[PDB]
Each structure stands twice: as structure tokens, then as C-alpha cells.
Amino acid sequence: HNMKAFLDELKAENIKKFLYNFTQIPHLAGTEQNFQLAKQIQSQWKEFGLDSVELAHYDVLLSYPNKTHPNYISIINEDGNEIFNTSLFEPPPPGYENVSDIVPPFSAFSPQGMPEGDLVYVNYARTEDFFKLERDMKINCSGKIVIARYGKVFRGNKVKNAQLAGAKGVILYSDPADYFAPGVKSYPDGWNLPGGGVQRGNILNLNGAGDPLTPGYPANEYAYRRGIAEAVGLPSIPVHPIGYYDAQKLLEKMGGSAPPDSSWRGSLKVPYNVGPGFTGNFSTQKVKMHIHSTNEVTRIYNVIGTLRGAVEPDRYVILGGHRDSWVFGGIDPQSGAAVVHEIVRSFGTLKKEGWRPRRTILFASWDAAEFGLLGSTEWAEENSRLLQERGVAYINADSSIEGNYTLRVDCTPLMYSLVHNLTKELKSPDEGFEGKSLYESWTKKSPSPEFSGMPRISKLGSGNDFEVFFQRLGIASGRARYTKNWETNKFSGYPLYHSVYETYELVEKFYDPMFKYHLTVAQVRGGMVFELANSIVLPFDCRDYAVVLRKYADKIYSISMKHPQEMKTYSVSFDSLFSAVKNFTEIASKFSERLQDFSNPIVLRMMNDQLMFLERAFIDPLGLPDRPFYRHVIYAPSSHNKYAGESFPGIYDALFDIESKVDPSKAWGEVKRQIYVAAFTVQAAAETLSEVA
Amino acid sequence: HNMKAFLDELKAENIKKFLYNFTQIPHLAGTEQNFQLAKQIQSQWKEFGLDSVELAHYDVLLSYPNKTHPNYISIINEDGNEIFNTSLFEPPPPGYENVSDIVPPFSAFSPQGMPEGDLVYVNYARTEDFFKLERDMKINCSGKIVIARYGKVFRGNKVKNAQLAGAKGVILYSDPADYFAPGVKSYPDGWNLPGGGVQRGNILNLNGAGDPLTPGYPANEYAYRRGIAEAVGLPSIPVHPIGYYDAQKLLEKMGGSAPPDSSWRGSLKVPYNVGPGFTGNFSTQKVKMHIHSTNEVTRIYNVIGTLRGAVEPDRYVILGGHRDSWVFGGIDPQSGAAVVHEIVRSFGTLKKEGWRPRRTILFASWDAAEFGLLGSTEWAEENSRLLQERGVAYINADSSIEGNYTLRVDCTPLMYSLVHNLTKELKSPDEGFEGKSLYESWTKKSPSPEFSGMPRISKLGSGNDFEVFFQRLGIASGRARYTKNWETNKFSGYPLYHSVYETYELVEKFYDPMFKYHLTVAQVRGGMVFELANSIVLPFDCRDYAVVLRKYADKIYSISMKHPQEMKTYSVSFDSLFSAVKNFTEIASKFSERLQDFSNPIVLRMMNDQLMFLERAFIDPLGLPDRPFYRHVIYAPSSHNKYAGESFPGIYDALFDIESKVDPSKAWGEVKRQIYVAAFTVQAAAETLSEVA
Numbered sequence A, B: 001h002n003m004k005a006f007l008d009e010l011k012a013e014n015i016k017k018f019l020y021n022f023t024q025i026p027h028l029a030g031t032e033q034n035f036q037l038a039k040q041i042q043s044q045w046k047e048f049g050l051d052s053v054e055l056a057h058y059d060v061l062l063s064y065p066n067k068t069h070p071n072y073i074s075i076i077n078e079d080g081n082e083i084f085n086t087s088l089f090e091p092p093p094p095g096y097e098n099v100s101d102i103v104p105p106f107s108a109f110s111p112q113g114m115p116e117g118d119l120v121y122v123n124y125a126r127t128e129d130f131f132k133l134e135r136d137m138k139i140n141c142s143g144k145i146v147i148a149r150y151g152k153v154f155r156g157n158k159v160k161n162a163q164l165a166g167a168k169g170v171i172l173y174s175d176p177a178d179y180f181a182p183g184v185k186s187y188p189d190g191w192n193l194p195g196g197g198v199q200r201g202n203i204l205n206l207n208g209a210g211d212p213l214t215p216g217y218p219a220n221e222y223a224y225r226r227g228i229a230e231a232v233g234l235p236s237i238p239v240h241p242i243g244y245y246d247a248q249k250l251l252e253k254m255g256g257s258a259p260p261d262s263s264w265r266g267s268l269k270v271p272y273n274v275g276p277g278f279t280g281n282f283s284t285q286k287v288k289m290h291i292h293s294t295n296e297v298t299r300i301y302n303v304i305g306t307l308r309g310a311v312e313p314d315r316y317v318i319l320g321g322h323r324d325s326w327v328f329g330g331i332d333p334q335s336g337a338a339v340v341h342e343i344v345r346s347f348g349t350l351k352k353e354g355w356r357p358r359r360t361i362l363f364a365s366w367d368a369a370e371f372g373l374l375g376s377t378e379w380a381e382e383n384s385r386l387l388q389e390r391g392v393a394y395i396n397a398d399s400s401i402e403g404n405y406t407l408r409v410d411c412t413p414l415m416y417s418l419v420h421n422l423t424k425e426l427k428s429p430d431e432g433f434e435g436k437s438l439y440e441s442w443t444k445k446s447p448s449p450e451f452s453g454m455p456r457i458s459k460l461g462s463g464n465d466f467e468v469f470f471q472r473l474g475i476a477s478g479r480a481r482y483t484k485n486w487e488t489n490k491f492s493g494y495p496l497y498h499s500v501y502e503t504y505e506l507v508e509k510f511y512d513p514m515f516k517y518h519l520t521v522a523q524v525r526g527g528m529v530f531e532l533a534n535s536i537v538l539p540f541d542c543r544d545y546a547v548v549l550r551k552y553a554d555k556i557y558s559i560s561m562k563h564p565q566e567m568k569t570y571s572v573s574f575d576s577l578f579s580a581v582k583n584f585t586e587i588a589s590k591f592s593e594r595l596q597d598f599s600n601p602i603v604l605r606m607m608n609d610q611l612m613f614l615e616r617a618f619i620d621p622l623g624l625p626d627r628p629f630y631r632h633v634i635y636a637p638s639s640h641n642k643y644a645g646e647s648f649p650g651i652y653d654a655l656f657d658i659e660s661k662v663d664p665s666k667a668w669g670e671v672k673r674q675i676y677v678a679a680f681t682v683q684a685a686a687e688t689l690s691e692v693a
């Protein structure tokens, strides 16, 4: 009973069977189908040998289209005749044309409305796209309907940016430039997005809050709920997503200004004119949205499985991923959930033979992730005191594959050495690397930009269920999956993301026919959990944090140094931050020596608690400015793109666009304040590794 | 080497010697004398045998009178002639008439100004006094100078209440009704306040913030400071304290309305007319303040002593009390500091013979407590991550005596059983109880109102250095001292509080000539620290929390039930809170059985961590409404009197004066929200005591 016994028990054929099982019908959050799947998972986890398996339910704000009053968009003429209508549903894939309960495409949490107006095209609707429009092109989005292509940033940020530019509605679409890889066929004949395909997804800006109605507290049976007008993160203008056949019909008539440059042009045979409005002949025509979706408080269910630790049952290593899907969830999330299921089964086989992990392992099937990470966040709000004092690590397990090229890992620096060592012990599943380690194939295909002979590991961003554990609670977190070649593939994520076409067949035929990539991912996620839960000394290397802190401090300093006159005028010094980083490096190095050099379980557990609380020490209980649920001072989701991680976010946001601020004294004061906060937090985290007395 | 060896080493004669030593010259915060005393304490603590003794310094906002432009108050005639002036200093006591550097009476943090106006007398300036004036008497304080007698509530609350009533200045005075006990002589011939005596003290409303300039973060050498206009807690109108000879001259001419009733009348031979202004003959005369005090960032120094634990060096038991005084600090704080000094000496004698406590003991000499608990709060802000994860308990040690009648203890319910058991083992120092236990004399003199054969133990309020540890950080805290008979003595605290007359002689001649009460207090505080630091199982009884939670829930429910119609209309139910309290009781009882029933140090330490984190579980990281540094959901300082503890403060404040709110729907919504928060927090704390997996 060692890690190799655990790894060897995992089977590609089991993951395949589970994935097929989890993807035959839709499992939309808050629906009966998804409750039944929760009960099935609960039952099988018990069968598999877990000590306890419970449902934790919450009543949270969800959003659904109105079944009898469909959402759509029109081009309307001067008389008010609707001369073109967008689709009411995606053409269903072969053999699913009689599946019921496929939710039509919609933007979850859109308010109702029927705004009518002239179009402005805003590229990806990024902060810089709006800068370019308003500041350089002098185009005013006020009272216009904005059309934006999906890609580059989280769609919630797009909607916020449009709303702040004064738009009265947003139309999101998938451009073939971003969702149709050259030389591959459309689904069902290949893995590309067809013209009728549409990407679902919520457009909230929760900033870590969880259920919009109950920020701070679990949405239990006696919860006090905010009124809708005070809910967190809801958009104020209607929003709806469409495919590129429909987008072409909306864009082909566009007039006004030419696109400023080629980075504004997608692949449709249209000019990509910014607008506002249509060219000469069609200038009396307008665009009309019809959105009738409703928000409603709906019950959701997490499955929580427990495998009690033999020696430290009060230390938790968590493996969690969501179970709710937009439609069939062939990739997102069931390719991850099938892997979690096999990992539980494997741990349970060992448990039936008398083994227990040293520490407790918790397994989670989260609900309502698609609606804003609601299930994981409510559960963590409920259990925050247990998680704060006992949480060793959180390993996420959403989509196992988004490509077939190489490994992708995003994690805290505390897990870098764990990940390097583990991948050196795993077999590469890649063609041309048979008999070579996963470390070797991963390092060759995705070299670290900083270090020779190391692989790339990215910062954690957000848009997934580790968010509450890492950026709210300060629990060391990581995730891993197979991914595409990010050098040669210029499209975003995978084309069929959140569309009806994301099916079991998509995975089995095009992504992973042997289920070898899924198996590799099961080994990486499961092996990380195994080492975290069983290693005598927690497998965290604090010296890896010291190295990245220096890199982030150099980076934030170089950003500020674009304004040398203001740094002089306002006496802006990074000296304290570099001093704190230097101290962290020195103290971490001394702690590592002590960790090498001690039969005494109090010293050990004292040392394991210093390792466990180190991530915790980066939490500021006052949170970041106007984002009280982002409390980690080193990492937060980018204020311009929730998916991307930003380092020293408090300083970054204080410097961002600072040359445009009206009161430079005040703005540079706030930069200095954020420098102080970061230097202090780094020094305080360093001091948790000093001798305790 | 056991507790009895520790207790027996403590000597009344040593405490006397130390008190004499600490009270020969003033030790005002931020002055050179107080820095020299810090260095002396540091040196002696090292001599006494502590492992490490360091100064932790901070640069915080303090306040001082202007040496060359004295504060005073006048009655000014129509021509602007100042016909009466209040005193420039208290007549110094016998033999101290040539002591330099006695700070004259002043209100620390008063802004500058010379407002001129008509007087209104506002009794104790309590919330209910202002209600009575504005609502019942229809007296308008707007643009008036308010004169208030000290007593009943913290003077900071008085100033806030006056400021919100629209006053343009506040004059505080000591009425003989509150500071002159019948049949006792004035200092130097007895322990009463003379007519020339004046009570110093700050008038901030920090609500737990610490240094007004750096809320959240220690005021270290690179701290970003708020501007003064954004500082926390500063009063907006000038304020100055006077004695009763001067008060009589201000009050004797008062006209306008009669006092509403006898509870408004003190003991001066004046009518206690409310005003506004003076009677007929003197109605053209006005009162003029002259305040020239300045706020300035000033260095302060805590002494931090460490006695490393032999077995759990990463668990901290803290004994802390302040060292800064208004003048000589005969009682406040040096009667406490002399006791701490003897406790350190005693622990050090054991340490020199080879003993170490099981857990680490930290000893603190805090600075600038008189200016808003600044030294303890900055240090705790600096070390918050260590204290959060490792802090077992905080025992305070300010004034050891405020009377000679019986023991007074205020503490978390987690320490009730500890205090009962320890006092049963200590000798009573009281006349008539020779050979009887302190428990027996204390229980006879100060019976618990709830239980036969138990003594009274009060809730922790605030106004002392446990505040950051308990209501911000959630570390189990307690305090103990000798006190007066609260049934027969209707005056407040002790008469000479914060006056020049609070000297070594006051204590030696009138309060405790044998130093037997000081010795008893040293035994209670030292014994509590000894048991907390050495007992194998932490000496906390979670079942005592279950009992008081029920009492507080009954109390808050009965307050709400004064509005049965609104409870019906708005569907206000306490069901969830009573359910959470019931669950807490059941789970606590099961935890206690497990604590009785387990050679296994992981179980033990797991159980000790459940005991240690139980106080911690009552912390809400979002804080109470508009008081982010009061995070404890069961206890906060009363919003009307910082000194008094309030239970379920979030609910209490939501119900307070609710019948006057303009939007009852909104106000009752907030009551329900606070009920949810409290029920949730109680249930969550309960669940930290459940089996961990």
C-alpha cells in the first residue's frame, strides 16, 4: 500500500465507462436530472468504500430561459417588421435530436428586456477595446447595442465593460477566427464549432461572493436573502449569445467607421465596421433583443465524501470538481468528474484492504459551478472555520482535457516541487515519448520561460471551484489537465465549449479515444492528493514561494517605473517590498534546513502546521479594495479578466491606467498604500516560518 | 515544580517594592521617562530568566497639551472680559509639588478651537440623556456648549453623543455625587477626589481600530498613514475636563429648564438646571473654551518577554498589561504592572531550577493604552497570523485593585471552571474569612445572580488591552482584580482615577497596606496563566459557553418581544438561534465526554486545538455593521458605552430604539438578518466540536 498501488489501480476503461454514464442526458444545475445524478454519485461513493457520503444542499439564485417565451434577436425595419431572427436552439447533434430538456443558448442572469437600437462592434469587449473606441476612435457606446466576439477574457468582464460604456444590451458571438481551427471539420465530423453552435455561460461579476443573495453566509434554510436590487454581481442590461451564421447576418450590414486595425477583424466575410448602425441603404433598420429569462432561488446539491485519516483525521486534503453541466458536459465537467469517480474507486479499493491515508481526504461533487461557482462557495462559507484551521490543500477536477498535446498545471508555488517530482515518476502518454516520463514530455513541449529543463506552471486564476479555497480562504490549491499546443493553436480554449455539441462522442472520437490522457490526468490529480494526504512531512517547498515573490516584485516595480517623474514627485519606493521578499527568502531557507534536520511528532506537526498555514498567511482579512472575497495579497483574479491570475493585484490595480486619473496625488497615495500592505503581508508570512518561540 | 511552587514564590513585599519603583515619576506614553522604564523592564525580565525580551516599537498618533499655550475655560461677559477661568493644573499632592512633567488635565485627541456659547447641562451625556433632552424636553443642543458629568459610560461615547446632538464643545466634570464617597476624606487624608482634582482620558471612538492613522496594519517604519481628516475615531469638537470647584462656578448660574427629575441632580449646591444659558442677571454672559492641544505621531514601545514551552512552544499563553500612565499611575496601571513583574520573577525562579511550562508564555508591557489601546493593538496587528493560529489565551493585567472588598473577574465562559477551581485552592485575604478559600469569600460577597453557591463573573467589555485579542482575534481572554462593594458604593470606579492624586501613597495608605490584595490578584492572574500554559488538556469547558448562549438568546428574544405586532407583520422568528444554541449544547456535551475518554498525543492535540479554536469560531471575518474590528458575534463593546460588554450585539443594535426608525420594514429586515448571522455563527462554532471526520 503505497502510491504505486494507488496509481496502478486506476484504469482508462473505467474513466471511459463513467464518462459515458455521466453524459447521456443534460445535468443542468437545479434540475431533477442533476439531483438524480447527485444521488447516484453518493450511492457509488459509499459502494466504493468511503466512510461517509452526504448531500449538502443550498437554495441559491439561478437563471433560466422562459420555456414559453423564447429569447431571440431581430433586425427590425422602419415599420417594425422583424426581417431576420436569430435561432431559437442549436441544431441538435446526430442521435440527440429527440433528447428533451436541452436548455437553449442564453446568458445566465441576464435581466429581461426588449431594447431596440443601433449596433456598435467592440471586438472582444476588453478594457483596451473600450479604451480604443472611446479614447482613440471617439465612438460613444451610450444607448447602443454592443456586439462583441467571445474570446480572450471572461464574458462577465465584457458585460461589465459594456455596461460601464453605457450600452443598453450586449450580443455575444463565437467568431470562426477564435472557434474554428484551420483544416478541421465542424462537429459531428471534427471538433470545430458549426455556424449554428452557441456558447452558453453566466455573465455575473460575483468577485468571489457565491450566491448573489447571501454573500458571506451559506444559503441554508433560514438564510436572510438580499432583495434582487441589492444582489451581488447581476448585469443591468440584457445579454444573449449567438453563433456565427447569425452573427454574420447582424454584422454584414454594419456602417460607420472602419475597424481600427486587423486585430479587430475576425474570419467572417464582413468588413468588421465598428458602427454605430448600418450602411446607407439599411440605416433605418435597427437591432432588437427579446430576453425573458428569469432568476429564481433553486435548490442545489453537493456530494461530500469522507475518507478519515488514520493519524491526522483533523487535516483535510480536498479533491473537488463540479457535476452540473450546460447540456451534456462531455468535456466540461464530466471528463473531470469521471476522473474523480475513478480516483475515489481506487482509494476505496486500498481502504477495503485495510489501508487509510495519514490525513483525511474529502471528495466533492459541486453543483451550480456554471452559475458562478455557487455550490463550492456556499459549502466553503458554511464550513469556513473547519477549512481555515484544518485545510491542507484543495485539488480541483473540472475538465480533464481541452486538447491532446501536453500537460497544463496551474497551482500555488507551494506545490511546484510536488508536481515536478510526481510527473518524473509518471509515464508520458504522448506519441514519440514512449518509455519517457511525463515530466520529460511536458518539459519538452511546454518549457518554462524562466528556467532551463523545467516545465511551465501557471498562476491560479479563477472561473473555477478552487476560487473560494485559494483567494478567499488561503488554502494551497492546484489543478491539472491535458491541453492544446498554445504556440501553434491561436483559437481560445476548445471550440465546442458550453455548446450542445460537447458530447461523449466528441471526447471518444476526437480528443482521447484510448482514454490515455484522462488516465494521465487521473494519475496527476490522484497522485497529488495521495502525496498531500500521506506524506509524513507536507510536500510543500516554501523556497519556491520566495523565488516567485521576487519575480512578481520585479514585475510590479517595472510597471511603476513607466512613470519615473511621478515616482519622484510622490516619493514612491518599492524598498519595503523588496526588503520583505529578501527576508522571506532568508527565513524560508532557514526553515527548510530545520525541516531537513529534526522521531519528535510535536516538532513535525508544529512544522506541518507552519507549512499548512503559510498559504494562509497571505490572506488579508480586510480583502482587496471593493472586493472583500478576494483576500489573498499575492494573487487575485484579474479585474479585467476573471479567468487570469494577477500578481500583487492590489498594487497592479492601483497602477492600472494611473496616467488617466484626475487626482494624481490621491492615485499615487493609493499605490504607496498598496505597496505597504504587500510588504507587510510578505514579511508577516515570512515570520510564520521563523522559530515559534 | 507545580502550581503551588509557583504561587508560593510570589511575595507581597516584592509587589510593594516594584509598585514604589514604578510610580516615582510620570510615565506618559511617548515620553522619554516611559521609554526609560521600558528599557528597565526589559533588562529585569532578562535578569529574571526569560528566554528573550525585546522592545516592539510603533509610530502612532498621540495628543498633548501645548506647554506654552495652556487649555482652560472661561465665563466671558458682554464686553468679552474673562471673569472666571478654570484651573491650569491640579494642585500637586504633598511632596510632589516640584515634580516636573506632570501633564495638566486635558482630553486626549480634542481638536483645537476657542468656541464661545451658551451651556446646556446633559447629565451623564448617555444616549438616554440625549433622548430625554431632545425628545421629551424639546431642548436643542445645536451650537451649544454641553457640560456633562463623568460616570456611567466611557467618555468617548459622551463626546460622540454630544457631537451628534450638534454641540460645539464638551466640558466634562467630576461630580461629588459620583466621585466623593460619603464619610471619607479628600486626598491626601483619604481616598476621595478633591475639588481641584481632574480626571484625564482620551475621547476617541476607535471601535477597536488601534492607531487612528493605520487601521488594519502595524504602524511600522514604512506604514502608509491616513491623512488626519480620514483618521479613525477623532472627535470633531473641542473637549476639556475640570474638577468640581470649577464645575460649580460653571453650573451655579444656569437657567432655562429645571432638571427633569432627581437622577439628573448631583451633589453640588446648584439647581442642575439644564439651560440653555444662564438665569436673568447673567444671560448676556457666555462660556468660552481655549483648546490648543496637538496630535502628533510619536514613537511607543512594548516590552515582549518569551518563556519557551518545553512541549508545545507553538502555543501561546499571554499575560499582558500596559505600562504608560496619565501621571504617576499608582493604581492605573502600575498596581497591575508590579504584579506582572512579580509573576515574571516567579516563573523565572522555576525556570532557573530547570523547569519550563508545557506551552510558551508571552509577557507584555504595553505602551500607549491610555491613548486608545494603541500598543497592544499595533502589536497584535503586526502578529495577527501567529496569534490567530497559535494563541491559547490572553490574561490582562491592568489595575490590580479598585477597592478592597472582594474579587472581580470578567472573562470568556471558557474560563469559568478554570476560575472556580483555582479560587477554591487560594486563601481568602479578607477579614473574617481567615482559613477560608477565596472562592468562599468571593461567592459570599458577590453571589452570582443566576446560581446558588457560585460567584458573579461578568462578560468582557472593553476600554482595556484584551480588546484586540478577544473581540478582533477571538482568543479566549480574562481579567481579575480586587474591587469595591457594588451594592453599598454608588460612586463610579475609584474616585482618584486618572488624577495626579493616584500615587504610591494612595495605595500603601488607603487601599492595600499589607499588599495582600495585590498578592491575591497575582495568585489569580499567575495561577490562571500557569494552568493555561501547563495543563495537559487546555482548562476550557465548552459546556459553560452552551449555558450562557441560552441565557443571551432568552435575553435578546425578550427584547424583541416588546414589539409583538412587528414580529407578526415581518415574520421575525428566533427559532434558528434557539435551534443553533440547542445543537451547541448537545455537541458540547458529547465533546466533553470524548475529552474525558481518550496515551494518544494527536487526539489530545487535536482535542486541544478544538478547545483553542472554539473561541476563534465566534469571529465573523466581515465584522459587525460599520465596526469591522469588532468581529466576535457573541460579545462586543456596547455601542453606547465602550466599557460594557453587550451580548448578541449585532441583534441588540438592530433592535435598539427600533420603534423610532422611519422604515420599519427595512429595520425589521436587518433584525432578521442579524438573527441569521448569529444562528449561523453559533451552529458553525458548535460544529468545530463535532468529530473531525
Ligand SMILES: *[C@@H]1O[C@H](CO)[C@@H](O[C@@H]2O[C@H](CO)[C@@H](O[C@@H]3O[C@H](CO)[C@@H](O)[C@H](O[C@H]4O[C@H](CO)[C@@H](O)[C@H](O)[C@@H]4O)[C@@H]3O)[C@H](O)[C@H]2NC(C)=O)[C@H](O)[C@H]1NC(C)=O
Binding pocket: A576, A577, A579, A580, A583, A679, A680, A683, B221
Ligand atoms: C527585513 O528584516 C530586517 C531584519 O533583519 C528588518 O530590519 C529592521 O528594519 C527596521 C526598519 O528599518 C529597523 O528599524 C529601526 O529600529 C531602530 C531600533 O532597533 C530605530 O532606532 C530606528 O529608527 C530610527 O531611524 C529611522 C530610519 O532612519 C527614523 O525614521 C526614526 O525616526 C529613528 O530615528 C529604526 O526604526 C529595525 O531595527 C530592523 N530590525 C533589525 C535589524 O533587527 C526589516 O524591517 C525587514 N523588512 C520588512 C519589510 O519588514
Ligand SMILES: *[C@@H]1O[C@H](CO)[C@@H](O[C@@H]2O[C@H](CO)[C@@H](O[C@@H]3O[C@H](CO)[C@@H](O)[C@H](O[C@H]4O[C@H](CO)[C@@H](O)[C@H](O)[C@@H]4O)[C@@H]3O)[C@H](O)[C@H]2NC(C)=O)[C@H](O)[C@H]1NC(C)=O
Binding pocket: A221, B576, B577, B579, B580, B583, B679, B680, B683
Ligand atoms: C440543529 O441541528 C439539526 C440536526 O440534528 C439541524 O437539523 C437540520 O435542519 C434542517 C433545516 O430544517 C433540515 O433541512 C431539511 O432537509 C431535508 C433533506 O434532508 C429537506 O428535504 C428539507 O427541505 C424541505 O422542507 C423545508 C422546510 O419545510 C422546505 O422549505 C423546503 O422547500 C423543502 O420542501 C429541509 O431542507 C435538515 O434535514 C436537518 N438535518 C438533520 C435533521 O440532520 C438544524 O438545522 C440545526 N440548527 C441550525 C440552526 O443549524
Ligand SMILES: Nc1nc2ncc(CNc3ccc(C(=O)N[C@@H](CCC(=O)N[C@@H](CCC(=O)N[C@@H](CCC(=O)O)C(=O)O)C(=O)O)C(=O)O)cc3)nc2c(=O)[nH]1
Binding pocket: A152, A153, A154, A200, A201, A202, A204, A332, A369, A370, A371, A372, A373, A398, A399, A408, A409, A446, A456, A458, A461, A462, A463, A464, A483, A485, A486, A487, A492, A493, A641, A642, A643, A644
Ligand atoms: N507564451 C506561452 N504561454 C503559455 N501559457 C500557457 C500554456 C499552457 N497553460 C495555459 C493556461 C491557461 C490557458 C487559458 O486558456 N486561459 C484563459 C482561461 C480559460 C479558463 O480558465 N476557462 C475556465 C472555464 C470554466 C467555466 O466554464 N467556468 C464557468 C463559471 C465561471 C464563473 O462563474 O466564475 C464559466 O466560465 O462560464 C476553465 O477551463 O477552467 C484565460 O486566461 O483567459 C491556456 C493555457 N502554454 C503557454 C505557451 O506554450 N506559451
Ligand SMILES: Nc1nc2ncc(CNc3ccc(C(=O)N[C@@H](CCC(=O)N[C@@H](CCC(=O)N[C@@H](CCC(=O)O)C(=O)O)C(=O)O)C(=O)O)cc3)nc2c(=O)[nH]1
Binding pocket: B152, B153, B154, B200, B201, B202, B204, B332, B369, B370, B371, B372, B373, B398, B399, B408, B409, B446, B456, B458, B461, B462, B463, B464, B483, B485, B486, B487, B492, B493, B641, B642, B643, B644
Ligand atoms: N447587581 C450587581 N452587579 C454587579 N456587577 C458587577 C460587580 C463586580 N464587577 C464589576 C464589573 C464592572 C464594573 C464597572 O465599574 N464597570 C464600568 C467600567 C469601568 C472600566 O472597565 N474601566 C476601565 C478603564 C481603563 C482605562 O483607563 N482605559 C482607558 C483607555 C480606554 C480606551 O481607549 O479604550 C480609558 O478609559 O481612558 C478599567 O478599569 O479597565 C462600566 O461598565 O461602565 C464594576 C464591577 N458586582 C455587582 C453586584 O454586586 N451587583
Ligand SMILES: *[C@@H]1O[C@H](CO)[C@@H](O[C@@H]2O[C@H](CO)[C@@H](O)[C@H](O)[C@H]2NC(C)=O)[C@H](O)[C@H]1NC(C)=O
Binding pocket: A021, A022, A024, A039, A040, A043, A044
Ligand atoms: C449510470 O450508472 C448507474 C450505476 O450503475 C446506473 O444506475 C443504476 O441503474 C440500475 C438499472 O436501472 C439500477 O438497478 C440501480 O439502482 C442504479 N444505481 C444507482 C443509481 O446507484 C445508471 O442507470 C447509469 N445511467 C446511464 C444513463 O447509463
Ligand SMILES: *[C@@H]1O[C@H](CO)[C@@H](O[C@@H]2O[C@H](CO)[C@@H](O)[C@H](O)[C@H]2NC(C)=O)[C@H](O)[C@H]1NC(C)=O
Binding pocket: A074, A080, A081, A082, A083, A084, A085
Ligand atoms: C421573427 O419572429 C417574429 C415573432 O414570432 C415574427 O413576427 C410575428 O409574425 C406573426 C405572423 O406573421 C405576427 O402575427 C406577429 O405579430 C409577429 N410578431 C412580432 C413580434 O412581430 C417574424 O415574422 C419573424 N421574422 C422572420 C423573418 O422570420
Ligand SMILES: *[C@@H]1O[C@H](CO)[C@@H](O[C@@H]2O[C@H](CO)[C@@H](O)[C@H](O)[C@H]2NC(C)=O)[C@H](O)[C@H]1NC(C)=O
Binding pocket: A417, A418, A421, A538, A539, A540, A541, A596
Ligand atoms: C522532490 O524530490 C527531491 C529529490 O529527491 C527532494 O529533495 C530531497 O529531499 C531529501 C529528503 O529531505 C533530502 O535529503 C535531499 O537533499 C533533497 N534533495 C534535493 C533538494 O536535491 C524534495 O524534497 C522533493 N520535494 C517534495 C515536495 O517532496
Ligand SMILES: *[C@@H]1O[C@H](CO)[C@@H](O[C@@H]2O[C@H](CO)[C@@H](O)[C@H](O)[C@H]2NC(C)=O)[C@H](O)[C@H]1NC(C)=O
Binding pocket: B021, B022, B024, B039, B040, B043, B044
Ligand atoms: C527602580 O529599580 C531599578 C532597578 O533596580 C533602578 O534602576 C537601576 O538603578 C541603579 C542605580 O542607579 C543602576 O546601577 C542600574 O543600572 C539600574 N538598573 C536597571 C535600569 O535595570 C531604578 O533606579 C529604580 N527607580 C527608582 C525611581 O527607584
Ligand SMILES: *[C@@H]1O[C@H](CO)[C@@H](O[C@@H]2O[C@H](CO)[C@@H](O)[C@H](O)[C@H]2NC(C)=O)[C@H](O)[C@H]1NC(C)=O
Binding pocket: B074, B080, B081, B082, B083, B084, B085
Ligand atoms: C483669565 O485668563 C485671561 C488670559 O490670561 C485673562 O485675561 C488677560 O489679561 C491680561 C492682563 O490683564 C490682558 O492683557 C490679556 O489681553 C487678557 N487676555 C484675554 C484673552 O482676555 C483674565 O484676566 C483671566 N480672568 C480672571 C478672572 O482671572
Ligand SMILES: *[C@@H]1O[C@H](CO)[C@@H](O[C@@H]2O[C@H](CO)[C@@H](O)[C@H](O)[C@H]2NC(C)=O)[C@H](O)[C@H]1NC(C)=O
Binding pocket: B417, B418, B421, B538, B539, B540, B541, B596
Ligand atoms: C474543575 O474541577 C473539577 C472537579 O475536580 C473537574 O471536573 C472533574 O474532572 C475529572 C478529570 O477529567 C473528571 O474525572 C471528574 O468527573 C470531573 N468532575 C466533575 C465534572 O464534577 C473539572 O474538569 C475542572 N475544570 C477545569 C477546567 O479544570
Ligand SMILES: *[C@@H]1O[C@H](CO)[C@@H](O)[C@H](O)[C@H]1NC(C)=O
Binding pocket: A066, A067, A068, A069, A292, A294
Ligand atoms: C413565461 O412567459 C409568459 C409570457 O408569454 C408569462 O405569462 C409567464 O409568466 C412566464 N413565466 C415566467 C416569467 O416565469
Ligand SMILES: *[C@@H]1O[C@H](CO)[C@@H](O)[C@H](O)[C@H]1NC(C)=O
Binding pocket: A140, A141, A142
Ligand atoms: C453619448 O451620447 C449621448 C447623447 O445622445 C450623451 O447623453 C452621452 O453623455 C454621451 N456619452 C459620452 C461618454 O460622451
Ligand SMILES: *[C@@H]1O[C@H](CO)[C@@H](O)[C@H](O)[C@H]1NC(C)=O
Binding pocket: A191, A403, A404, A484, A510, A511
Ligand atoms: C490530437 O492529436 C493530433 C496529432 O497532433 C492532432 O492533429 C489533433 O488535432 C488532436 N485532436 C484534438 C481534439 O486536439
Ligand SMILES: *[C@@H]1O[C@H](CO)[C@@H](O)[C@H](O)[C@H]1NC(C)=O
Binding pocket: B066, B067, B068, B069, B292, B294
Ligand atoms: C504652541 O502654542 C504657540 C502659541 O502661543 C504656537 O506658536 C506654537 O506653535 C505651539 N506649538 C505647537 C502647536 O506645537
Ligand SMILES: *[C@@H]1O[C@H](CO)[C@@H](O)[C@H](O)[C@H]1NC(C)=O
Binding pocket: B140, B141, B142
Ligand atoms: C436647533 O437650532 C438651530 C436654529 O438656530 C437649527 O438650525 C437646528 O436645525 C435646530 N436643531 C434641531 C435638531 O431641531
Ligand SMILES: *[C@@H]1O[C@H](CO)[C@@H](O)[C@H](O)[C@H]1NC(C)=O
Binding pocket: B191, B403, B404, B484, B510, B511
Ligand atoms: C478598606 O476596607 C475598609 C473596611 O471595609 C473600608 O472601610 C475602607 O473604605 C476600604 N478602603 C478603600 C480604599 O476602599
